[PDB]
PDB file of N, CA, C and O in Angstrom:
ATOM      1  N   UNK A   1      23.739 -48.031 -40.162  1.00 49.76           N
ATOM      2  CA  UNK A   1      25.201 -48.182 -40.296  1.00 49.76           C
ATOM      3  C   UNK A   1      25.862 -47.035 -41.055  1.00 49.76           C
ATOM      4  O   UNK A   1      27.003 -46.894 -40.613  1.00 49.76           O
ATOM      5  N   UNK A   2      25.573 -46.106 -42.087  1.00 46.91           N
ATOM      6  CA  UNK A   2      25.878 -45.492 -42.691  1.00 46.91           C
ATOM      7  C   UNK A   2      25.544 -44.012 -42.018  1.00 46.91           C
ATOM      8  O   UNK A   2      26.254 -43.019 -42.179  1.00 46.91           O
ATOM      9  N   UNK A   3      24.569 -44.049 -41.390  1.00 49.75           N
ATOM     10  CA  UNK A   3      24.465 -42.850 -40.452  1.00 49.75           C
ATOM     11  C   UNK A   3      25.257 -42.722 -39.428  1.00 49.75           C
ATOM     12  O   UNK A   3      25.764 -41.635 -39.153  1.00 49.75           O
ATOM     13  N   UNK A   4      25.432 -43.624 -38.849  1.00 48.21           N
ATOM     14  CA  UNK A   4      26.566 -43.635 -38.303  1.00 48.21           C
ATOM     15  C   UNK A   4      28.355 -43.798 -38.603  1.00 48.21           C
ATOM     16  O   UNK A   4      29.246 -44.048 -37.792  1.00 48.21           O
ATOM     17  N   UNK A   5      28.394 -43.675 -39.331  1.00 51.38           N
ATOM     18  CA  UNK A   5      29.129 -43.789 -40.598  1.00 51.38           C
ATOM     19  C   UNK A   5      29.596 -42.217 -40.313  1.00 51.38           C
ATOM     20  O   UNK A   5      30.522 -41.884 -39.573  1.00 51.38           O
ATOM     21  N   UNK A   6      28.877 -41.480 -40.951  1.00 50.53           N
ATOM     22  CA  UNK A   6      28.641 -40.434 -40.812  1.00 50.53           C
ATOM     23  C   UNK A   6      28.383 -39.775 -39.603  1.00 50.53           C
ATOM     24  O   UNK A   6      28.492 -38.549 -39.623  1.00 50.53           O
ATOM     25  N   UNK A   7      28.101 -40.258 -38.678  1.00 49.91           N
ATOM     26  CA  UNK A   7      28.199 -39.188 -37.337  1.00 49.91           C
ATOM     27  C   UNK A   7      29.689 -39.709 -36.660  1.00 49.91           C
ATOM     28  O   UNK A   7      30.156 -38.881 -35.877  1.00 49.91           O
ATOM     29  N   UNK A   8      30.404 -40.798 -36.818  1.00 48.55           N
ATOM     30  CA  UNK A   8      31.526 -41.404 -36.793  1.00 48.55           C
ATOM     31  C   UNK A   8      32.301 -39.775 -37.242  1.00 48.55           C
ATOM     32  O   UNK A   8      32.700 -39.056 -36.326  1.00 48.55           O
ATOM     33  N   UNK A   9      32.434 -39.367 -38.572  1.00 49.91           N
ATOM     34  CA  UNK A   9      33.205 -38.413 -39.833  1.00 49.91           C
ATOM     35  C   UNK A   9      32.573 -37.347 -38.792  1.00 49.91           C
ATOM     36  O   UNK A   9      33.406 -36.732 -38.127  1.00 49.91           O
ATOM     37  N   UNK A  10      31.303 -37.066 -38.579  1.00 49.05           N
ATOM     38  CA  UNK A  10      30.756 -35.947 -37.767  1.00 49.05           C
ATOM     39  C   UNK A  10      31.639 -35.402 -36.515  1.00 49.05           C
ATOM     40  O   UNK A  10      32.059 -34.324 -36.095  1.00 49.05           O
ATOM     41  N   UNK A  11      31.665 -36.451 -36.251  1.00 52.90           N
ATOM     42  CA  UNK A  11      32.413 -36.409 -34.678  1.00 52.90           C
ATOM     43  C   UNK A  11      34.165 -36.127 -34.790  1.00 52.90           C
ATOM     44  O   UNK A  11      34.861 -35.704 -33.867  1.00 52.90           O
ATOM     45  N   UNK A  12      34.561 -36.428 -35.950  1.00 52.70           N
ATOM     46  CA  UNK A  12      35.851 -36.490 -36.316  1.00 52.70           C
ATOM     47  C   UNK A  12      36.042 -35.047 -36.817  1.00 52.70           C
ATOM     48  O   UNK A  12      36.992 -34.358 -36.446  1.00 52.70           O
ATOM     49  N   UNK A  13      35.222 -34.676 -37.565  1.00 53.31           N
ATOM     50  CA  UNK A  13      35.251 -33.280 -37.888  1.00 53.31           C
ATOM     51  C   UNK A  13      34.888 -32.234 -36.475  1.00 53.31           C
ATOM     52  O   UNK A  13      35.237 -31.054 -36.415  1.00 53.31           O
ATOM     53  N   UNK A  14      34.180 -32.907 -35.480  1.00 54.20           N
ATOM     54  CA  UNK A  14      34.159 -31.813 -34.189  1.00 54.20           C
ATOM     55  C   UNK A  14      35.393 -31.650 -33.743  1.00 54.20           C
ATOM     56  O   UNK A  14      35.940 -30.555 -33.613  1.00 54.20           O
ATOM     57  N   UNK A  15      36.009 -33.003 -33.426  1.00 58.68           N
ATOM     58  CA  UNK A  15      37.533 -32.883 -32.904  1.00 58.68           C
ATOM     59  C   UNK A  15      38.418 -32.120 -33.715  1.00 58.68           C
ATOM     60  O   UNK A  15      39.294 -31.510 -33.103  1.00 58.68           O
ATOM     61  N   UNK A  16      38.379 -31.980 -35.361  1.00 60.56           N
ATOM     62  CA  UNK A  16      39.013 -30.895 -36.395  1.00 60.56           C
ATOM     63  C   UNK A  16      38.423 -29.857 -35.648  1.00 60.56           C
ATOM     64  O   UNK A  16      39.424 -29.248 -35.271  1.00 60.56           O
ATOM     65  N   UNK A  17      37.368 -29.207 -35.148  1.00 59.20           N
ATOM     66  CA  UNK A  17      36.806 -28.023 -34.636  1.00 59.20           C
ATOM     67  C   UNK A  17      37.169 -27.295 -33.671  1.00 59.20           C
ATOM     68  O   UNK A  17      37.150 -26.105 -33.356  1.00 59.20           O
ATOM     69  N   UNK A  18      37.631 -28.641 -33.116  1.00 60.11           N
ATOM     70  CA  UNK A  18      38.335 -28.115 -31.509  1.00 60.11           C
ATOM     71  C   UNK A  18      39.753 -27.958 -31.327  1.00 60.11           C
ATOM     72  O   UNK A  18      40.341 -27.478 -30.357  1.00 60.11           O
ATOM     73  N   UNK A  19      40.299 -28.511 -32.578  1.00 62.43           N
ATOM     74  CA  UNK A  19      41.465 -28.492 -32.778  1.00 62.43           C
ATOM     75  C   UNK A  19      41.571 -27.028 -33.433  1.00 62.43           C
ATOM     76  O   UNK A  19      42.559 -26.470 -32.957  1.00 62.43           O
ATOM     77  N   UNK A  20      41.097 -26.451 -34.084  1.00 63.22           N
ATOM     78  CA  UNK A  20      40.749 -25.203 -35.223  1.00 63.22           C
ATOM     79  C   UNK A  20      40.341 -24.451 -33.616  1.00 63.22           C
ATOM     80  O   UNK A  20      41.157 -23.572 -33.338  1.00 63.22           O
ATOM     81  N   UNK A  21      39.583 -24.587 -32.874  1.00 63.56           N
ATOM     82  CA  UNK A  21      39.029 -23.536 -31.770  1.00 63.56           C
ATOM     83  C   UNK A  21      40.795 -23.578 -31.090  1.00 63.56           C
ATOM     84  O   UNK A  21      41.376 -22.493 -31.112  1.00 63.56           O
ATOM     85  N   UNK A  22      41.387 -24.504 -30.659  1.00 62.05           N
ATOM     86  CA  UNK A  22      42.434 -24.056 -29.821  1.00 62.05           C
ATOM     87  C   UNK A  22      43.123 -23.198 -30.683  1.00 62.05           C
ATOM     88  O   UNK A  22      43.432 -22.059 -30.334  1.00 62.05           O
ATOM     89  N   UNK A  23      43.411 -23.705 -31.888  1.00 58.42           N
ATOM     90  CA  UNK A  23      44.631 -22.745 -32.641  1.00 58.42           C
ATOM     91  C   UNK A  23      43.939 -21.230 -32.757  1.00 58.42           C
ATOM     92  O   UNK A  23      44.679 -20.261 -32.585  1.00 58.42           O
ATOM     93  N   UNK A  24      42.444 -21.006 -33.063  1.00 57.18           N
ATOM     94  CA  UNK A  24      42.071 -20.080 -33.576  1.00 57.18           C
ATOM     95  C   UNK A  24      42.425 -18.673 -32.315  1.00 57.18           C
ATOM     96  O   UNK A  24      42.183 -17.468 -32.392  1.00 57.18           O
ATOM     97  N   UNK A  25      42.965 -19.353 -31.414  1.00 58.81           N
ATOM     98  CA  UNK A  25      43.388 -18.465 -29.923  1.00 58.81           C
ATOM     99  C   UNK A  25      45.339 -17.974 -30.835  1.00 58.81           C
ATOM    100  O   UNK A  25      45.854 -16.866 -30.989  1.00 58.81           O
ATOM    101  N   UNK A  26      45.870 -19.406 -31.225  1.00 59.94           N
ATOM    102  CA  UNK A  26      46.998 -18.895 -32.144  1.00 59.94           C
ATOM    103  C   UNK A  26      46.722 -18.151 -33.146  1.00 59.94           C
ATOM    104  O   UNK A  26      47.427 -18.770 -33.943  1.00 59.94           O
ATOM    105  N   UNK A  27      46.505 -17.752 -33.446  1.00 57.36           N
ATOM    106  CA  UNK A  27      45.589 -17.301 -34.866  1.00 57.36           C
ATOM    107  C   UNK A  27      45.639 -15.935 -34.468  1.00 57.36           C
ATOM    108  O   UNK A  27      46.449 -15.124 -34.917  1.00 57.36           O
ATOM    109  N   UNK A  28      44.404 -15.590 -33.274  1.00 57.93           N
ATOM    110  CA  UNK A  28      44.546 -14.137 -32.932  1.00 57.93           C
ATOM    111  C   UNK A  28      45.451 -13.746 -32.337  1.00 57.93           C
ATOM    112  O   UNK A  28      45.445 -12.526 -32.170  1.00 57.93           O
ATOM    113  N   UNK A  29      46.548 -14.467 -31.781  1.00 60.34           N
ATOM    114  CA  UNK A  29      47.734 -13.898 -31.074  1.00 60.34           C
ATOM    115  C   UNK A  29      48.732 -13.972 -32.173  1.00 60.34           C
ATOM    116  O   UNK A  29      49.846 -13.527 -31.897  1.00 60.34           O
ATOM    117  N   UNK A  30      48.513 -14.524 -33.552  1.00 61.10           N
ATOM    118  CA  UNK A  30      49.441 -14.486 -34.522  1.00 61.10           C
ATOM    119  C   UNK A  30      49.289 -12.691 -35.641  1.00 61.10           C
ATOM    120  O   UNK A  30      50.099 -11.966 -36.219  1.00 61.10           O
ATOM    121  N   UNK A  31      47.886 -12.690 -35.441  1.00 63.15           N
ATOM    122  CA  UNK A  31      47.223 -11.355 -35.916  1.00 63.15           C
ATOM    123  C   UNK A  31      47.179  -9.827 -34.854  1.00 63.15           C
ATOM    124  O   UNK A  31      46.931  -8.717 -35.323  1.00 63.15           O
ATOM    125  N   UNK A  32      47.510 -10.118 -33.205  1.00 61.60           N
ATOM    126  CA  UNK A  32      47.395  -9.420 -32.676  1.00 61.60           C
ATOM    127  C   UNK A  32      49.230  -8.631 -32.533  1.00 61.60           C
ATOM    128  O   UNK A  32      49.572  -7.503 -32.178  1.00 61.60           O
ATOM    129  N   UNK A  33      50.094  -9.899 -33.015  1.00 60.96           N
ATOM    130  CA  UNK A  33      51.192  -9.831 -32.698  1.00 60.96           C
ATOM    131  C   UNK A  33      51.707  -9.030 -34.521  1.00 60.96           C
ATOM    132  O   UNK A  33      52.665  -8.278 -34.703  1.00 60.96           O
ATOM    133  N   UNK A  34      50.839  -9.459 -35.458  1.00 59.98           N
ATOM    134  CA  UNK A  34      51.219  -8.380 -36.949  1.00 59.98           C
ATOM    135  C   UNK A  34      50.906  -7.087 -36.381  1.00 59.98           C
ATOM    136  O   UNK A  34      51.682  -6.178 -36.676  1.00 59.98           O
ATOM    137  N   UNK A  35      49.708  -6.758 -35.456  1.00 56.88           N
ATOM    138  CA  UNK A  35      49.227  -5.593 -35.389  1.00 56.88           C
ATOM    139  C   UNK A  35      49.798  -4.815 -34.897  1.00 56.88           C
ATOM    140  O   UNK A  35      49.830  -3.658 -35.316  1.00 56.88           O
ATOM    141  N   UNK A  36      50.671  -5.397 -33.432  1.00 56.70           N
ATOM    142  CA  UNK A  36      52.167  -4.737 -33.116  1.00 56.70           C
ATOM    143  C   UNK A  36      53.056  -4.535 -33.228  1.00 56.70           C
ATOM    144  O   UNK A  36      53.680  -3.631 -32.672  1.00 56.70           O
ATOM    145  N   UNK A  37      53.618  -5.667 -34.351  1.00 60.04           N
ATOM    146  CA  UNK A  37      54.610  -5.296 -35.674  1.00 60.04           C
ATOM    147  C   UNK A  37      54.240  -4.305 -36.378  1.00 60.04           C
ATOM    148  O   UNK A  37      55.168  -3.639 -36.839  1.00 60.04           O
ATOM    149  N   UNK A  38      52.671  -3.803 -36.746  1.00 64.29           N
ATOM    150  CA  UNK A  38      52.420  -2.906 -37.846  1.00 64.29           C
ATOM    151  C   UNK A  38      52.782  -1.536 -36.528  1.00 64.29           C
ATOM    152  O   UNK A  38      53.505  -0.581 -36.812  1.00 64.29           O
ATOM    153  N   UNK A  39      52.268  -1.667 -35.427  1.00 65.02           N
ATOM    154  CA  UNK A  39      52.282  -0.190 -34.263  1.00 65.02           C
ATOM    155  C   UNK A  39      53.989  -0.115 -34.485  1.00 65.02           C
ATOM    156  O   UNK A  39      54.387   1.042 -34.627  1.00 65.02           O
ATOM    157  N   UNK A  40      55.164  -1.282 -34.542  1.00 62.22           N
ATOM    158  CA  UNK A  40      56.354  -0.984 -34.041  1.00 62.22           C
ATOM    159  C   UNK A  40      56.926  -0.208 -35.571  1.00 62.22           C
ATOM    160  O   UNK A  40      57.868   0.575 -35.701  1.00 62.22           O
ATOM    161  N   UNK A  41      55.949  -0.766 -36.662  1.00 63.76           N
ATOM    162  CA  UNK A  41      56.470  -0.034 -37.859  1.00 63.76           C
ATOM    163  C   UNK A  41      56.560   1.341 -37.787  1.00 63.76           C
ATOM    164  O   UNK A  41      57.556   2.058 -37.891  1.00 63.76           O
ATOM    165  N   UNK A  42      55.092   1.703 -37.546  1.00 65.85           N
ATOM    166  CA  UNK A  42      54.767   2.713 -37.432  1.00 65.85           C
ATOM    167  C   UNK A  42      55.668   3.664 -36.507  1.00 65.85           C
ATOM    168  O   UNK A  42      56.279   4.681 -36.836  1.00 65.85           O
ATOM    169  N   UNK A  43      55.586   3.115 -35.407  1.00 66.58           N
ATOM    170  CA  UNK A  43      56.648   3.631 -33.838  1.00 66.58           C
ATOM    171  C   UNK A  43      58.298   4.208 -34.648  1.00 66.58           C
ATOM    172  O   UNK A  43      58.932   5.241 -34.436  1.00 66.58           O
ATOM    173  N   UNK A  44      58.600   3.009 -35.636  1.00 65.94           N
ATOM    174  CA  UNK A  44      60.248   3.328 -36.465  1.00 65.94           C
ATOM    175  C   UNK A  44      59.991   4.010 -37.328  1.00 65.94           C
ATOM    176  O   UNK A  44      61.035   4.334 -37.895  1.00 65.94           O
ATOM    177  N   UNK A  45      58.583   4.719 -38.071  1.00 66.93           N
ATOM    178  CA  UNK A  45      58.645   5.538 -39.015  1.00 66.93           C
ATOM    179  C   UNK A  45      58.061   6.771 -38.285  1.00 66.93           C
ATOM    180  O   UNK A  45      57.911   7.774 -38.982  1.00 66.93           O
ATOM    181  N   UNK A  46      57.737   6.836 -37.085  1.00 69.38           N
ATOM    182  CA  UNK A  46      57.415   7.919 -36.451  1.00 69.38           C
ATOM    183  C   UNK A  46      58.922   8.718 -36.294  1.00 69.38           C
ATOM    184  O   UNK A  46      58.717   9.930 -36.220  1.00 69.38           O
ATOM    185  N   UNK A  47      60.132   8.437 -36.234  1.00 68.75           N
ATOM    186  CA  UNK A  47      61.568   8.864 -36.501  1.00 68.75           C
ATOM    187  C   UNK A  47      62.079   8.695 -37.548  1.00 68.75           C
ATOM    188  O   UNK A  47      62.870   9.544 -37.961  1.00 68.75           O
ATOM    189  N   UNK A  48      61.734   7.330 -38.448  1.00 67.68           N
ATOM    190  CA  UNK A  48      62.480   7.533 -39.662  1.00 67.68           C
ATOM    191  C   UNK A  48      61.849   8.217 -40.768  1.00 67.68           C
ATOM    192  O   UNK A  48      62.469   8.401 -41.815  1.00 67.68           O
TER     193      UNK A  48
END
């Protein structure tokens, strides 16, 4: 009962995992999208 208990929390924490795997796609499009903010910085200090 308690092992299962625990693979119950196990299983609950996979679904946290998969929830964390979809975002972690937000995540790199949140980091890919600084990185083109940092290129557009760069792009406005290439004139300013």
């Amino acid at each position: 009962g308690n092992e299962q208990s625990l693979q119950k929390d196990l299983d609950f924490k996979k679904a946290k995992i998969v929830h964390l795997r979809q975002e972690s796609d937000k995540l790199r499009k949140s980091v890919e999208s600084l990185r083109d903010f940092q290129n557009k910085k760069g792009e406005i200090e290439l004139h300013s």
